[PDB]
Design a binder for this molecule. Sequence first.
Ligand SMILES: *[C@@H]1O[C@H](CO)[C@@H](O[C@@H]2O[C@H](CO)[C@@H](O)[C@H](O)[C@H]2NC(C)=O)[C@H](O)[C@H]1NC(C)=O
Ligand SMILES: *[C@@H]1O[C@H](CO)[C@@H](O[C@@H]2O[C@H](CO)[C@@H](O)[C@H](O)[C@H]2NC(C)=O)[C@H](O)[C@H]1NC(C)=O
Ligand SMILES: *[C@@H]1O[C@H](CO)[C@@H](O[C@@H]2O[C@H](CO)[C@@H](O)[C@H](O)[C@H]2NC(C)=O)[C@H](O)[C@H]1NC(C)=O
Ligand SMILES: *[C@@H]1O[C@H](CO)[C@@H](O)[C@H](O)[C@H]1NC(C)=O
Ligand SMILES: *[C@@H]1O[C@H](CO)[C@@H](O)[C@H](O)[C@H]1NC(C)=O
Ligand SMILES: *[C@@H]1O[C@H](CO)[C@@H](O)[C@H](O)[C@H]1NC(C)=O
Lengths: 32, 123, 106, 49, 312, 227, 70
Amino acid sequence: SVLHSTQDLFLPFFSNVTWFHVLPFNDGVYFA
Amino acid sequence: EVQLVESGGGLVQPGRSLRLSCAASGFTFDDYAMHWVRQTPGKGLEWVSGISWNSGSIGYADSVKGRFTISRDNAKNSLYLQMNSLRAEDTALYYCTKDLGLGIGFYYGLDVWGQGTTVTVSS
Amino acid sequence: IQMTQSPSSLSTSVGDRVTITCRASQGIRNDLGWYQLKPGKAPKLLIYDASTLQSGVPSRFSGSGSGTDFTLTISSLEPEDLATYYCLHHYTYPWTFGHGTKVELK
Amino acid sequence: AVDCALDPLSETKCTLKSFTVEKGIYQTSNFRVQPTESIVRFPNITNLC
Amino acid sequence: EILPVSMTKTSVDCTMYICGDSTECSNLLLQYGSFCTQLNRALTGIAVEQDKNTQEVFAQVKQIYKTPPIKDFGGFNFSQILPDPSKPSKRSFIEDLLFNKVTFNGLTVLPPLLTDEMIAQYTSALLAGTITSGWTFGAGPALQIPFPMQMAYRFNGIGVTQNVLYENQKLIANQFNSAIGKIQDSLSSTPSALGKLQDVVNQNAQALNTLVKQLSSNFGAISSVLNDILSRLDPPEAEVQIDRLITGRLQSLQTYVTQQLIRAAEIRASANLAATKMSECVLGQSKRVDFCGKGYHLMSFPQSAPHGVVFL
Amino acid sequence: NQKLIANQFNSAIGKIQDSLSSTPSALGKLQDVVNQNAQALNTLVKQLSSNFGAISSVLNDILSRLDPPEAEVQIDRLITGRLQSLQTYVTQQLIRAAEIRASANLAATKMSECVLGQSKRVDFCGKGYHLMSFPQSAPHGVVFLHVTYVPAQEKNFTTAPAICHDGKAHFPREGVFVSNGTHWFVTQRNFYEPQIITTDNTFVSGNCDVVIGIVNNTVYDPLQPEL
Amino acid sequence: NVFQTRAGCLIGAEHVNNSYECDIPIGAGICASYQQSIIAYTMSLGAENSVAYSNNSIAIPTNFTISVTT
Ligand SMILES: *[C@@H]1O[C@H](CO)[C@@H](O[C@@H]2O[C@H](CO)[C@@H](O)[C@H](O)[C@H]2NC(C)=O)[C@H](O)[C@H]1NC(C)=O
Ligand SMILES: *[C@@H]1O[C@H](CO)[C@@H](O[C@@H]2O[C@H](CO)[C@@H](O)[C@H](O)[C@H]2NC(C)=O)[C@H](O)[C@H]1NC(C)=O
Ligand SMILES: *[C@@H]1O[C@H](CO)[C@@H](O[C@@H]2O[C@H](CO)[C@@H](O)[C@H](O)[C@H]2NC(C)=O)[C@H](O)[C@H]1NC(C)=O
Ligand SMILES: *[C@@H]1O[C@H](CO)[C@@H](O)[C@H](O)[C@H]1NC(C)=O
Ligand SMILES: *[C@@H]1O[C@H](CO)[C@@H](O)[C@H](O)[C@H]1NC(C)=O
Ligand SMILES: *[C@@H]1O[C@H](CO)[C@@H](O)[C@H](O)[C@H]1NC(C)=O
């Protein structure tokens, strides 16, 4: 029940990510 | 029946001095500000100078500043413009007008316009 | 304080509403006048202050606007109405006239 | 969550630490102009100490 | 009577002031981070009040009033207070006189919400309303009344029968006109006439100079130029030197901010008094002994002055 | 006009409830006070998590790791910072409290002048001519309901300073001389109640020469018809 | 929607010729309101009401209104 501000999160909001049906690993990667 | 009559407009050599007199009739002269307006043949109307009822407030156009003097005689009902260092650009049709206000306060505008006089500056 | 008047010229038919716009470099509160100039005739004071018509001026002419932007409107054009129009600010010496707008029949 | 750098409104929320922002004008950032390049001017000396 | 109403709005960027675009200094300043925010917030509050002060004193009536284009209202001139085209901002003769007499890093000055022209227009409206409608425009619908008759009402308030005014109208008018004439001379001759307003200006400037000067103090560090320390000592050692500067510069801001808060409070008190006088002295006839001048009060006129108001 | 006045008063009171409810910012002034105090207190609490240059912001940790000689240095940094944080807080409260005190004094004055009497100050107790005020308690404050009389529906009439009868100037003892069309009357200034000019309501000051604007008219005499 | 103001450059607001009562203060006599896009306009001091002033004319109220204020 608190709002905390931190710099840990690394995913930019509303960013178009590459779509695939070797990819460089740059400062972490989000996989879905 | 307010009538403003202009006089003293004539051909003048450049650099000479000329005086314009406007005669006022049909209204109380000491109850309204007076203004001078000139119509250039090739250009739109240009405001030249304005004087209040008691002569306390006087204004001049930037172009004519320092060469033109406006004076009024309340007793004689006459408006005088003195022109010095005349130049070719000055040639125009000069009109004496009557301000609706007193040159001070909240009401302004040129209610009455005289027929006008022609001044030509040429060599 | 420079006054800019647009359009420089317009052509309209009789019975057509006419709008003329005058703009000011700095705010002039409500001090403005609209003057009608006809060839061979002394200029005439149509409107003073912002929207106050002079006595003896037809109702068709109307004045609008405040501060920087000011507008003059003629509900219906008439043959008599075809003349140049000028806007003069009365805010402070020196008073400055606008370039002027010429109205002519199509 | 709120991404502060996404847009000005988002940034305002981060500064006010509240998701809801009331009507008004809020100063949330400072602006600077970055230097285009680095220029070094030294004396012209050939002699070696 | 001359009353200070507002002070200059100043905003200081704490980070830029303490650290000159130096990332190293900024990281050190992250410690005790709240301090920076608290400072900016405090100064912001001060700035907002300044706008509030001005509105309370001038923006009370929201209608514009104009006097008729006549030379005398029953022999009372009123010319000096009325607006003049010759004057620079269309201000009155007296107001013009008043404005003549008064004379980087992260520091910045924020423009006042109400421009001088707007304030001038407010004063004129108040003045016009009083000359044409007496004290009725502040209590509801404004109703016209001949000025000569208005003065008769004022005389009854002080306790003198109205006949006295009508039988000495001419004399009273001359006396009034003469007094107004002296006002102009008085302000001009007495250089210290507007000292009260001038003091406000000097204090603010003085404070700001001191703040700027402080940036050249070592506070115990090898140098007062941050770039130098950064350009000489290595990171571990530099930290020590930078901390000294941060501590000193940080303290300098707090002192400045604190003084402004206390000083601002004084101005606010003054503004509230000015507001009261505008309502009681200008928009009505006061019975308080010396609230509106010495003697039995009849009427008051408001004239705008830089960062303040002048009441006649 | 008792009935009319009563209805008007009742109607106004009815609107009060609606006004406060509709306008969310109606009690903004009181709300601001609450927020400022809370804001200040949050900041003070937050400051306890700042290092101020020490290895850590948790006192127990430093005590649980470094030895006494070294710990002193670290603790001093924290003490200095935390000490400064309090002074800043205290200073703000002093200045803020002063502002509230000024406000309280004004509230006290209004209670005595507006509620316990009828004030003549122009806008000390609402806009218009003050009649009476009612006090209502509000959280950390007070709300005053001011009842005022506002004139309305004005009409324009010709006016004269004095009336010249038999060479004697007549001045109204109370009110003003008004004229609708060709009839001259004397009326109270605030409200229009025309009454015939008579010796009873006017007083004689002198001849008819000094006054400027005096108009000729007849001043009725009550005694003459009986006699 | 890039406009220049004494306060500074303003973006995302559309200049409006009409003057309205101030809603959000931008400084230097400029205020911003949400009317749907945000609009920037010069604030208006007030409406023009002028009593006809004559030397022999007076206006007397013929009615009254009782008002309660908070
Ligand atoms: C109102 O007062 C002004 C002065 O403030 C009078 O105007 C001045 O009159 C003198 C001569 O008496 C002139 O020399 C000045 O040039 C006038 N103007 C100023 C600004 O001083 C004016 O006469 C007075 N009004 C009446 C009706 O007497
Ligand atoms: C008011 O009444 C008096 C007296 O009846 C008028 O005084 C007369 O004025 C005229 C014009 O000047 C003179 O010819 C008479 O001789 C005056 N009579 C007396 C007895 O003094 C006065 O004029 C009237 N006022 C108006 C405005 O009609
Ligand atoms: C004074 O104003 C009141 C309203 O404030 C008038 O009362 C109204 O009269 C009209 C008819 O003319 C009715 O329809 C309304 O219902 C009345 N309102 C109330 C609240 O009673 C009153 O008539 C006015 N007085 C005069 C003399 O004009
Ligand atoms: C009220 O003013 C009007 C002009 O607006 C005028 O015609 C009328 O005569 C005035 N009323 C009286 C009683 O004089
Ligand atoms: C003026 O008002 C009174 C009021 O009773 C009336 O008797 C008189 O006839 C009126 N005169 C007019 C309307 O000319
Ligand atoms: C009122 O002014 C008029 C001009 O509008 C004038 O004729 C009349 O004499 C004046 N009245 C007084 C009492 O001065």
